[PDB]
A paper describes a structure:
Here, a 2.4 Å resolution crystal structure of RadH was obtained using an analogous FDH as a search model, and the crystalline form of this enzyme revealed two largely identical monomers in an asymmetric unit. Each monomer consists of a conserved Flavin-binding domain with FAD bound and a chlorine atom located in an adjacent space. Docking of 6-hydroxyquinoline was performed using DiffDock and suggested that the active site of RadH be the space currently occupied by the flavin moiety of FAD and chlorine atom. While the docked poses overlap with the FAD structure, previous experimental results have shown that nearby residues K74, D325, and F328 are essential for RadH activity, validating the RadH active site proposed by the docking model. The closest structural homolog of RadH is the FAD-dependent chondrochloren halogenase CndH with the lowest RMSD score of 2.39 and 29% sequence identity. Spatial superimposition has revealed highly similar folds between the two proteins, except for an additional omega loop (Y138–P154) in RadH. This groove is also where the C-terminus domain of RadH is located (top). As a result, we hypothesize that the C-terminus of RadH has a similar structural role as a docked carrier protein, positioning the enzyme in the correct orientation for catalysis.
In particular, the fungal halogenase RadH from Chaetomium chiversii has been shown to be particularly promising in the tailoring of non-tryptophan-derived scaffolds due to the relatively broad range of reactions that can be catalyzed. Based on the study by Menon et al., RadH has demonstrated distinct catalytic activity towards hydroxycoumarin, hydroxyisoquinoline, and phenolic derivatives, in addition to its native substrate Monocillin II. Our investigation revealed that RadH could effectively halogenate hydroxyquinoline and hydroxybenzothiophene.
Residue numbers in the entry:
A (entry chain B): 2 to 261, 267 to 441, 505 to 519
B (entry chain A): 1 to 258, 266 to 440, 505 to 519
Amino acid sequence: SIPKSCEVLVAGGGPAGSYAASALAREGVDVVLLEADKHPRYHIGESMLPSIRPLLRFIDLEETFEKHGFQKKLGAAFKLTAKREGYTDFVAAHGPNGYSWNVVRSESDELLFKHAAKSGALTFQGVKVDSLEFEPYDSDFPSGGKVANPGRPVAARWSAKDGRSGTISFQYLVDATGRAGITSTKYLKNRKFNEGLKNLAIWGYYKGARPWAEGTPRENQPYFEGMRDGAGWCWTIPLHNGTVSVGAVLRSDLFFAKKKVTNAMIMAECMKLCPTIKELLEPAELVSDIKQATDYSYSASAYAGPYFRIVGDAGCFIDPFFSSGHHLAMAGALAAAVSIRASMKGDCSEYEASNWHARKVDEGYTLFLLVVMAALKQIRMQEEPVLSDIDDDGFDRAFQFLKPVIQGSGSAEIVKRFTKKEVSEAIDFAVLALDGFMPRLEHGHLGLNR
Amino acid sequence: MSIPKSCEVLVAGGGPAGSYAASALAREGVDVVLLEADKHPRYHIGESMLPSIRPLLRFIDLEETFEKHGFQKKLGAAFKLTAKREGYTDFVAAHGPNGYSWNVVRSESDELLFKHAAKSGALTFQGVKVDSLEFEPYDSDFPSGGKVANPGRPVAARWSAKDGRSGTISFQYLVDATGRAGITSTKYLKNRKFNEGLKNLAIWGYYKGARPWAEGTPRENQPYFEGMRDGAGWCWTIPLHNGTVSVGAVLRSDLFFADVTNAMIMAECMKLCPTIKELLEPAELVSDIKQATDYSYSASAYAGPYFRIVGDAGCFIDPFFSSGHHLAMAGALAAAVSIRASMKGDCSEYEASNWHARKVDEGYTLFLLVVMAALKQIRMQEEPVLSDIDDDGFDRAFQFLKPVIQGSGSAEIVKRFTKKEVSEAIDFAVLALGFMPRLEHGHLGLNR
Ligand SMILES: Cc1cc2nc3c(=O)[nH]c(=O)nc-3n(C[C@H](O)[C@H](O)[C@H](O)COP(=O)(O)OP(=O)(O)OC[C@H]3O[C@@H](n4cnc5c(N)ncnc54)[C@H](O)[C@@H]3O)c2cc1C
Ligand SMILES: Cc1cc2nc3c(=O)[nH]c(=O)nc-3n(C[C@H](O)[C@H](O)[C@H](O)COP(=O)(O)OP(=O)(O)OC[C@H]3O[C@@H](n4cnc5c(N)ncnc54)[C@H](O)[C@@H]3O)c2cc1C
Ligand SMILES: [Cl-]
């Protein structure tokens, strides 16, 4: 049965949970991982970044993902306005071995979850964390502006649908709960929504649509374009299941402003405002149900505290235009494992480690924030030279600067590919468009240097 | 009813390549006569298929009949070349959940194909043996060379029946689907050239009560192939809807000898395949253990003046990657395309015969170098032949070999894999070592 005591409790067996559980268990930590669903289970989020490989490599899962046979993504196209699309190429930057994947999430989350068990973490499914018990930490615990002291969490109550129930004690907590955000939403209450990105989304899977850039060395790559009226944007993501993932994103007010099988109809109506998406789906056959979900973007006032870490959607969320969700989940899961291991064996104080994790979550989120915002500003405009596109017929100059951030660099040190000089130019270029400790990433010696 | 004296196309041999070519031609309205020396249903080896079977069967509208029969669906195949982790090819990953293939009791599918030829409008006769072919001199503008030959034009065939009846039938085109007998290639062109490295022999039997491989996994009970640990050969397990698993071993003719031997060597090769033995741990033999010749061969030419050679009648490669049934029907399609193109004036006969012969050669060459690379890795048990920089197993190699192993790279009906991907499959194996079809029903032929 589930043990009463462990070293680290990881709440939620999603990508950020399984990654943090595996990375800690591969260091020998007595990790317990609790997941309310039994894998495989459906979840949306199939487009990945090339940063997935260095992250998966640290936990020795990269080749297992390669051997599964997901649809490879060599890049992504972004037709923000009526001008010709901008395109980021993964295999050009990282070589012919540097492609990423478009992923059926029911299977990758299983691969990560089973890898956590094979890594030596105690994994349990159908077990839901009902509550967290924060003991008072009445001692000084300073912040740099991104950690909070609701006390120290030391026990969690859990239930299983087969009727068993109990409580588990732990020394550290990893919050990978997801949108539910148990710590951020239900013990803390520090979710800060961005009113400009309070979006809604609808999607479905289609068979027989014909690929983009047929014959071209960029055939059937993921394709994103903004609506010609500027109200939102749509995506196409082809998958190995034989279907292409298709969906549309609109702000909550602008979504019902077009309410003037309703979900299937607005899917077709919003599709009209994307002429190239409209062209690709001409012969398409619908095989999926068309599903709607909330898609609000939010940050948090704190991402860590006394002996607990918040990772992935449990802390922050940004509009999935640049496929940042799965990247930021595992990138924060690595920072949680690094900061916990540093705290465990005395590389630094807990407040030094907890603050370090919270920054790596905050600055990583900030990078995609200003980049996605610049694209969404260009999508909300159409004729105005956002990204400085006045004299050109495309965005290729803009995506030459946005290269490192769009491909997942700029905060996690494990993404060695791009220099911090190039990243700085990615930040400077994007803000003008809108206008210490060091990880020891060695297996068996994970922690922080000064 | 009896065999007619004249027809448009005579198809010799009612195997898969014969029945497919008969159906594809008869569905175009051609007066096709199909002669088969064996009476269906009859036993024949070859039970593992490729996912390319569906686009081929769909062109002749036979997919749904095969689906309704209930063959064991095949989602992929495993290949444990050496003691390292298995390599695996995934059909459902590439072709979707409806793109699986089958493991097939061949006595029943060959009958379905043969009867489908009759429903397609071909005149089908069983127990009728083509004894000889009458090649008239074709001294016209038709040179030899390029995988085409000019032994003259075949225009009549002598035939015999098991009741004693005999006669002769005239035809404008010939389709040689006779098989290993290879009437045209072995006794009229005399152009079968064996590869001395692949002069293999095989033994097999069917076992009941064996337990599935990879139980519980989404890849449970898929066909499993592994090379013998001493490097002498390889074994297979192919589970069938019959509740039994087809089990067999393949050895080179010299290494084979290194009656009762068949039952004993069956156990010895199984012992040299630890995972095959594990699946057959409680198994009981219900079949006879049978031996047959399994030599690999090519031909200097696969077509000529108004005749087409398809399947084993032309070429054969070691069945490690289950290429035999694919290449049979893939060549049968090319024979129907090239004959119809010649019939309706899309191009000259000399242009069509070269196109068919190239598609037989080009398809065979793909599987040749791929099987050769895998069999070299099996004899180099300890040497990395197909092992690249990796963490374990051969699965990275099978990600490169993916399109050829699943039947792409020559047949135009298998669109699934890009022509970019096929190029890397060719280079990967070698480094270890015009006309366009009109695949329209009722408009079959060639464009330029
Ligand atoms: C429409 C849409 C499109 C998207 N497209 C993309 C894309 O293209 N690319 C991309 O990278 N991202 C995309 N995302 C985002 C992506 O879905 C997430 O960012 C990603 O799943 C990372 O979050 P996570 O790791 O927490 O996963 P989650 O699925 O949020 O993991 C949380 C897990 O914890 C479990 N859990 C919840 N409560 C408890 C509890 N009390 N106890 C135990 N377990 C619990 C849940 O069942 C779940 O399995 C998209 C999101 C949306 C809405
Ligand atoms: C041990 C072994 C294992 C194999 N495993 C596989 C496998 O897993 N998968 C796979 O795809 N392939 C496999 N094969 C290959 C497969 O058996 C053949 O490649 C495939 O069946 C193609 O045969 P065919 O239709 O061309 O010839 P056949 O199937 O032999 O058909 C020719 C027919 O014509 C008849 N005939 C012969 N002479 C005459 C004549 N003169 N007149 C009239 N009719 C005549 C024959 O009786 C026969 O019925 C294997 C082969 C061997 C030896
Ligand atoms: Cl992207």
